[PDB]
Design a protein that fits this description.
- Keywords: ATP-binding, Glutamine amidotransferase, GMP biosynthesis, Ligase, Nucleotide-binding, Purine biosynthesis.
- It holds the Pfam family GATase.
- Catalyzes the synthesis of GMP from XMP.
- The structure is a monomer.
- The protein is α/β, with parallel strands linked by helices.
- It has one domain: Class I glutamine amidotransferase (GATase) domain (Rossmann fold).
- It contains 5 helices and 11 strands.
- The chain has a 9-stranded mixed β-sheet.
- A hairpin with a 4-residue loop joins strand 10 and strand 11.
- It starts with a strand and ends in a 6-residue tail after the last helix.
Length: 185
Amino acid sequence: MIVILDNGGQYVHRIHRSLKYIGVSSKIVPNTTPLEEIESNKEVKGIILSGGPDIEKAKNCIDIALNAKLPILGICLGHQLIALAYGGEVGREEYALTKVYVDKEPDLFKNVPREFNAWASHKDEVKKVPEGFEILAHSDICQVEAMKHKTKPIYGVQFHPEVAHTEYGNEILKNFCKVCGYKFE
């Protein structure tokens, strides 16, 4: 089971819905839910940080990013949270298909073409990647469309693989759930 931290955004139901579609159980929890509570449930094999309108209403997500022992996928505000939590740079709203380019055969993008259209808003973005992170994807308007901690199962995407307008969105979720011990025949 995957725990989804409700950072207050519009597509949280969509994360739950899309995980169910590919065979993955998930529970939406208030974003104040303590890390200990999340990892004490032996059924939990990973954590998704959702999108949300305000970085300051999601500061619990910092302790989780720093200290969780489980895999983490941060989505939009979730990705920006992972970045600030590890000393990187976030900074400054409508939703559109963005052409994203994959950088160099990361697992996050197994079975995804080198280019694909991603449902994204760039209200904000990671301006500078934390030390010890690598960039996994970019576009013409955003240098950091996806990233990963080089030594930890911690993944960041600026876009919404949960929304069906994202090409291979369900393949990106499969690739992340693969890290949480799931197999997709």
